[PDB]
Design a protein around this ligand. Sequence first.
Ligand SMILES: NC(=O)c1ccc[n+]([C@@H]2O[C@H](COP(=O)([O-])OP(=O)(O)OC[C@H]3O[C@@H](n4cnc5c(N)ncnc54)[C@H](OP(=O)(O)O)[C@@H]3O)[C@@H](O)[C@H]2O)c1
Ligand SMILES: NC(=O)c1ccc[n+]([C@@H]2O[C@H](COP(=O)([O-])OP(=O)(O)OC[C@H]3O[C@@H](n4cnc5c(N)ncnc54)[C@H](OP(=O)(O)O)[C@@H]3O)[C@@H](O)[C@H]2O)c1
Ligand SMILES: NC(=O)c1ccc[n+]([C@@H]2O[C@H](COP(=O)([O-])OP(=O)(O)OC[C@H]3O[C@@H](n4cnc5c(N)ncnc54)[C@H](OP(=O)(O)O)[C@@H]3O)[C@@H](O)[C@H]2O)c1
Ligand SMILES: NC(=O)c1ccc[n+]([C@@H]2O[C@H](COP(=O)([O-])OP(=O)(O)OC[C@H]3O[C@@H](n4cnc5c(N)ncnc54)[C@H](OP(=O)(O)O)[C@@H]3O)[C@@H](O)[C@H]2O)c1
Ligand SMILES: CCCCCCc1ccc(Oc2ccccc2C#N)c(O)c1
Ligand SMILES: CCCCCCc1ccc(Oc2ccccc2C#N)c(O)c1
Ligand SMILES: CCCCCCc1ccc(Oc2ccccc2C#N)c(O)c1
Ligand SMILES: CCCCCCc1ccc(Oc2ccccc2C#N)c(O)c1
Ligand SMILES: N[C@@H](CCC(=O)O)C(=O)O
Ligand SMILES: N[C@@H](CCC(=O)O)C(=O)O
Ligand SMILES: N[C@@H](CCC(=O)O)C(=O)O
Lengths: 255, 255, 254, 255
Amino acid sequence: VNLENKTYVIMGIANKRSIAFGVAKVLDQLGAKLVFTYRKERSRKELEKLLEQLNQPEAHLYQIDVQSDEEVINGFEQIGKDVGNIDGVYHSIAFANMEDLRGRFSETSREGFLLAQDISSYSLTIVAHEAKKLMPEGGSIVATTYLGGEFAVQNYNVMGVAKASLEANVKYLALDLGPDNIRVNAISAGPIRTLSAKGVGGFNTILKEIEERAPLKRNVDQVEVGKTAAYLLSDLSSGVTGENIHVDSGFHAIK
Amino acid sequence: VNLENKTYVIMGIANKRSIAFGVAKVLDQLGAKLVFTYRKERSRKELEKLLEQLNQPEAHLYQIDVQSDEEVINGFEQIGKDVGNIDGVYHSIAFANMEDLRGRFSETSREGFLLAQDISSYSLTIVAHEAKKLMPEGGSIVATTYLGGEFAVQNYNVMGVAKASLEANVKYLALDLGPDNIRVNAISAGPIRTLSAKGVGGFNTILKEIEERAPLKRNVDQVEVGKTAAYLLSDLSSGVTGENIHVDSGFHAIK
Amino acid sequence: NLENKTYVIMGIANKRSIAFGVAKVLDQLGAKLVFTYRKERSRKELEKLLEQLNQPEAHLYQIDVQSDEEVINGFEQIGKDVGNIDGVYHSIAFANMEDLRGRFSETSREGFLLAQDISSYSLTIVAHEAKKLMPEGGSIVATTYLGGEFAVQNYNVMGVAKASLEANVKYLALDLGPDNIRVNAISAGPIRTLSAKGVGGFNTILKEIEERAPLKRNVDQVEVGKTAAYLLSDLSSGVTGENIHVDSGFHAIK
Amino acid sequence: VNLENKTYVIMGIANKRSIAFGVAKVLDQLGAKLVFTYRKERSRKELEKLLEQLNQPEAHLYQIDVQSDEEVINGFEQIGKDVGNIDGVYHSIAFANMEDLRGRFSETSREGFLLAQDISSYSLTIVAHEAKKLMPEGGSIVATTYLGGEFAVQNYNVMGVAKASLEANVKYLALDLGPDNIRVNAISAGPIRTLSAKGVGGFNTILKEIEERAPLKRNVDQVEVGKTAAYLLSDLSSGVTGENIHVDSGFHAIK
Ligand SMILES: NC(=O)c1ccc[n+]([C@@H]2O[C@H](COP(=O)([O-])OP(=O)(O)OC[C@H]3O[C@@H](n4cnc5c(N)ncnc54)[C@H](OP(=O)(O)O)[C@@H]3O)[C@@H](O)[C@H]2O)c1
Ligand SMILES: NC(=O)c1ccc[n+]([C@@H]2O[C@H](COP(=O)([O-])OP(=O)(O)OC[C@H]3O[C@@H](n4cnc5c(N)ncnc54)[C@H](OP(=O)(O)O)[C@@H]3O)[C@@H](O)[C@H]2O)c1
Ligand SMILES: NC(=O)c1ccc[n+]([C@@H]2O[C@H](COP(=O)([O-])OP(=O)(O)OC[C@H]3O[C@@H](n4cnc5c(N)ncnc54)[C@H](OP(=O)(O)O)[C@@H]3O)[C@@H](O)[C@H]2O)c1
Ligand SMILES: NC(=O)c1ccc[n+]([C@@H]2O[C@H](COP(=O)([O-])OP(=O)(O)OC[C@H]3O[C@@H](n4cnc5c(N)ncnc54)[C@H](OP(=O)(O)O)[C@@H]3O)[C@@H](O)[C@H]2O)c1
Ligand SMILES: CCCCCCc1ccc(Oc2ccccc2C#N)c(O)c1
Ligand SMILES: CCCCCCc1ccc(Oc2ccccc2C#N)c(O)c1
Ligand SMILES: CCCCCCc1ccc(Oc2ccccc2C#N)c(O)c1
Ligand SMILES: CCCCCCc1ccc(Oc2ccccc2C#N)c(O)c1
Ligand SMILES: N[C@@H](CCC(=O)O)C(=O)O
Ligand SMILES: N[C@@H](CCC(=O)O)C(=O)O
Ligand SMILES: N[C@@H](CCC(=O)O)C(=O)O
C-alpha cells in the first residue's frame, strides 16, 4: 500500500512476539501513525522499548482493559483528543484460563466460558462502537481469530467457542457499520509462538502438523498477518467486509 | 425409528407453540418416555396441560433455570433417581433482552451480550456435562439453532452471535463426548411463530421472504423440527455427530 | 416405515456397495426397490444379492448414466413396470485411476470431464427424468465425500467432481422444490468398497478417522442407509439442499 | 504492494468493462509488466485500443482459447520465450450457453453442462499446469468466482455448478502446488455490468438488491476487484492460499 496521513489504533501488544507487533511494524513501515493500547504495566514497558525499532515520532500509549466499558470509552475519547480522527483499529486481544483450557471441554466452568466471551468477543463490539466516533467518514476494523472458531480442534476448547462468537461479531458489526463506511473483517492466523500460545495444550504438535500437511508446508509469522492487516486496513480492500482471511499456509482448505 | 424403552429429556417447552413441544409430540408418538424441564411457573402449568395430549403415563417435570449450575446439577441428578439412565436431551433454550433484537448491534450492552451467551450457549455445555452421567451406554444431544448463527441477519443481533457460539459448542461437545458414544448435533430451524419469536424485530418479514424465496416455497413448523430431532436422537443417525441439520425448507442453501 | 413406498437405487456393484447398504435398510423398512446397474456383469451379481432382500420381484434395469437415452428410456420403463416412485438414491461416480493419485494439476481434460459427466451431471439428468415419475413430490439423495468441501490429498479430480455434485444438489433443490421434490447429499465417511480400491492412500484415511474422528471409529454402508432412510422418507420433510455427514464427526474437526 | 519487475498474465479481457481490465489498470498502475490473453479477434482489437491508456511500453498479446490443450500449452510456452519468467496469472474466464442461464436448471443439457465445466473450471487446471513452468521460484494464481458457486442463486444455474467446481479446483491446486510455493486463490466478485453479465437472467434485479441489502449498500466495480487482485498476486498475501476473498460489499456474509 501507502499509508501516510493515516492513523491506526493497535490493541494487544504484550511483547516483541505479539501478532499485533507484526501488524505494527508493517503499518509503521508503510507510513501510518500508530496509537497503542495495553492492559498490564509490563505490556506498556515492552511497548516503550519496542517503539525504538519503529519510525513513530511520538509514543501514543493508552491503558485499556477491555473488561471495563469506562476504560474503552475514556481511552478512545482521549485518543481522539490527542490525535484526532483515525482510520482503523487492529484488535488483537483474547483471554481464557488455563484451568478451563486443559479441561475436557464439557468440564468448562461458566465463569471461564463467559470470561473468554467477554474479553475475546464482546470487546470487539464496544471497541467498534467507541472507535466509530473517530471515523466520521469510515474506516476499517480488523480482529484476529483462529480456525478453531470454525472447527473443533483438540485442546482449543473454550477459546474455540469464543472465536466462533468473534467471527459472528465481525459479520454483525460489518452489517451494522457498513452504512457508515466502516468495514469489519477477521484474519484467521495460523499458529504462531506467542506468550498466549504457551497456554494452549498441544500447541507444538499443531505447529508440526502444519508443516507436514498445510499446502505451503510451513508455518506463518506475525509479519505475514501484518501484511494481510495492511491490506484490510487500507483502501486496497474497499469492497471487502464481513470477511475472514486465513493467513495460515492454506491449512484451512484441506482435510 | 421406534423409540419404546427410550427416555429423553426435553428442555424449554413454554407453551403449545414451543419448538420443543413439536419435538415432544413426535417423540411421544414414537413411544419414548419423556422428562421435561422448565424455568417459569407459568411454563410448568402449560406443560401440565399439554401433557394431556401426549401418551406419557406419568408426568416428569423439573424446574431448571440454566443460569444456575446448582439447578442443572441437582435437576439432572433428580432425573436419574426418578427415571434412571436416559438416552438423550433436546435443548430448546435461548434468551436475550428485547432491545438486543433490533436496531444496531454495535450498541449491544456487555450485560446483554453475556446474558445471551450464558443462557443460549453455555447452558448446553453444563447440560451435556450432567446429562453424560445418565448416559453410561452412550446417547444423543440436540440443540436448536438458527441460520443467524452462520450469517448476519438484520435484527437478530446479539442472538446471532450467541448461536454462532452455540454452534461451535456443539462441535466441541461432539469432539469431547464422542469417545463416550454421545453424539451432539444442532437443528437449524427456519422461522416459526413462537413466544420468543415475538422479541425479534422484523420477524414477519423474514417469514414471508421464506415463502417467496426458499426452495420449498413455504415455512416449516415445530413437528418438522420434531421429526428431524427424532432422527438425531435415535440410532438412525448413528455416525452423525457435530452436524447442523437445516430444517428451513432449503433456505440455508440459496442466496 | 416405508410400506407402499417405491425407491430407485442406482449403483450397486457388489455386497460392499454403499447402495447395497441403502437397499438392505430400505428393504428392512418395507419399501419396494428398483435397481439400476451399468454392465451385464453386475446383473448376475445383483440377482444373487437380492436373494438376501425381501423383494418379491427383481426390478433391474441397465442404465449407464453416460447416455441420455439410457437414462431417459430407463426411467420411462421403470414407470411402466412399477408406476410412480417416491425417490431416487444416487450412489454413482467415476474417475480414471491415474487421476486419483500423484498430481491434481496433471489431470487431463478428458479425465476431468469424465468425472464431471458421471459423478455430477448424471444427477441432473436422473432428477429431470425421475421427476416425471414423482408427480406429487418425492426425494432424491446423492452420495458425496468431504473431499468436495476441502482438498483431500489423492482424491483430486473426484474432489472437484464432488464439489460439483454438492452444488448440483443445491441447484436441483432450488429448481425442484416448488414441485415438492427434495434433493440432498449424504457425505459418507470412508468405507471399503470396490471403487475405493482406486483411490490412493485410502487405508491411511481409514486409520486417521479411527484416531481423530469424534466417534473414534469408522462408519458402514448400513449407517449410510439409515440416514438415507431419513432423507428419502417424510421424517426429513422441511430439509432440502442439505449435505448430512455420516462420518463419525470428521467434518466438524480440524 | 509495488510491482516493478513483476510480470503477470491477465486472461480474459474482452472490452473496457471486463473485470480483467479492472485488474490490469490496477496492476499497471503499480508498475507490473502485463501479458494479455484473448480468444476472439475482437478482444485483441479491444485490447490494442485499451493498451493506450496503460503505461505498458509494449503490447504482449496472445490468442489462447482455453478449450484447446495445444493453445494453452503453446500460448504459455511462447509467453515464456517472449517475456521470460512470470510472477502470476489472473484468470478471468468463464462461459455457458444462454439457454442454460435461465429457466430450469434440471433441464440443462449434458453438452451445456460440460461446456461450462470445461471453459470455466478445467481451464484453470491446465493454465496452472502450464503456468507453473514459468514460475520456478513460486508465484500467484487468482481466479474469479461468484457466490453462486457456494449457494444456489436463481438463474445462475449451470454456471453456479461450474463455479463450485472452480472454487474446489482452486483448493486442490493450492494443495498440489503449495510445495512449489505457488499460491492459488479466488476472488468472489459482486455483480458487475459486463458483456458476459448480459447473458444471465435477472442480473439487474441482483444489482439492486446488493444496494439495498449488502452491508456497504453499494455495488462494487472492476477496479475494486483489481485492488484485491493486486493484494493476492503480491507478497502482501504471502501466507494466503486456497482462499476465496469476497469483494462484494459484504453480501456473502448476510442472509
Ligand atoms: N499466536 C497464535 O498462534 C494465534 C493464532 C490465531 C489467533 N490468535 C489471536 O491473536 C490475538 C493476539 O494474541 P497473541 O498470540 O499475539 O498473544 P499475546 O502476544 O499474548 O497478545 C495477547 C494480548 O491480549 C491482551 N489482552 C488479554 N486480555 C486483555 C484485556 N482484558 N484487556 C486488554 N487487553 C487484553 C494482552 O494484554 P496484556 O498482556 O497487557 O494483559 C496481550 O497484549 C489473540 O486474539 C489470539 O487469540 C493467535
Ligand atoms: N421460533 C423460531 O423461529 C426459532 C428459529 C430457530 C431457532 N429457535 C430456537 O429454538 C429454541 C426454542 O425457542 P422457541 O421459538 O421454541 O421459543 P419459546 O417457546 O419461547 O421457548 C424458549 C424457551 O427457553 C426457555 N428459557 C429461556 N431462558 C431460560 C433459562 N434461563 N432457563 C431455562 N429455560 C429458559 C423458556 O422457558 P421459560 O418461558 O420458562 O422462561 C422457553 O421455554 C431456542 O433456542 C430458539 O433460539 C427458534
Ligand atoms: N466408499 C467410500 O469411502 C465413499 C465415501 C464417500 C462417498 N462415496 C460415494 O459413494 C458412491 C458409491 O460408491 P461406492 O464406494 O459404494 O462404490 P461402488 O460399489 O463401486 O459403486 C459405485 C457404482 O458406480 C457405478 N457406476 C460408475 N459409473 C457408472 C455409469 N457411467 N453408469 C452407471 N453406473 C455407474 C458403478 O458401476 P459398475 O461397477 O457397474 O462399473 C458402481 O455400481 C459414489 O458416488 C462414491 O463417490 C464413497
Ligand atoms: N461481471 C460479474 O458480475 C461477475 C461476477 C463474479 C464473477 N465473474 C467472473 O469474472 C470472469 C470475467 O468475466 P466478466 O464479467 O469480466 O465478463 P467478460 O468481460 O465478458 O469476460 C469474459 C471473458 O471470458 C473469455 N472467454 C470465454 N470463453 C473463453 C475461452 N474458451 N477461451 C478464452 N477465453 C474465453 C472471453 O473472451 P472472448 O470474448 O474473446 O471470447 C472474455 O474475455 C468470469 O469468470 C466470470 O464468471 C463475473
Ligand atoms: C491446539 C491449539 C492450536 C494452537 C492455537 C493457536 C493459537 C495460539 C494462541 C491463541 O491466543 C490465545 C489462546 C488461548 C487463550 C488466549 C489467547 C490469546 N490471546 C490463539 O487464539 C490461537
Ligand atoms: C431476524 C429475524 C429472523 C427470525 C428469527 C428466527 C428465530 C425466532 C426466535 C428465536 O428464539 C429466540 C429469539 C430471541 C431471543 C430468545 C429466543 C429464544 N428462545 C430464534 O432463535 C430465532
Ligand atoms: C484419500 C481419499 C480417502 C478415501 C475417499 C473415500 C471415497 C472412496 C470411494 C469413492 O468412490 C469413488 C472414488 C473414485 C472414483 C469413483 C468412485 C465411485 N463410485 C469416493 O468418492 C470416496
Ligand atoms: C442471477 C444473476 C447473478 C448475478 C451474476 C453475477 C455474474 C455475472 C456475470 C458472470 O460471468 C458469466 C456469467 C455466465 C456465463 C459466462 C460468464 C462469464 N465470463 C458471472 O460469473 C457472475
Ligand atoms: N503445554 C503442554 C501441557 C498440556 C497438558 O498436559 O494438558 C502440552 O503441549 O500439552
Ligand atoms: N416487531 C415489529 C417492531 C419492530 C421495531 O420497530 O423494532 C416489527 O419489526 O415489525
Ligand atoms: N434479460 C432478461 C431475461 C428474460 C427472460 O429470461 O425471460 C432478465 O433480466 O431476466
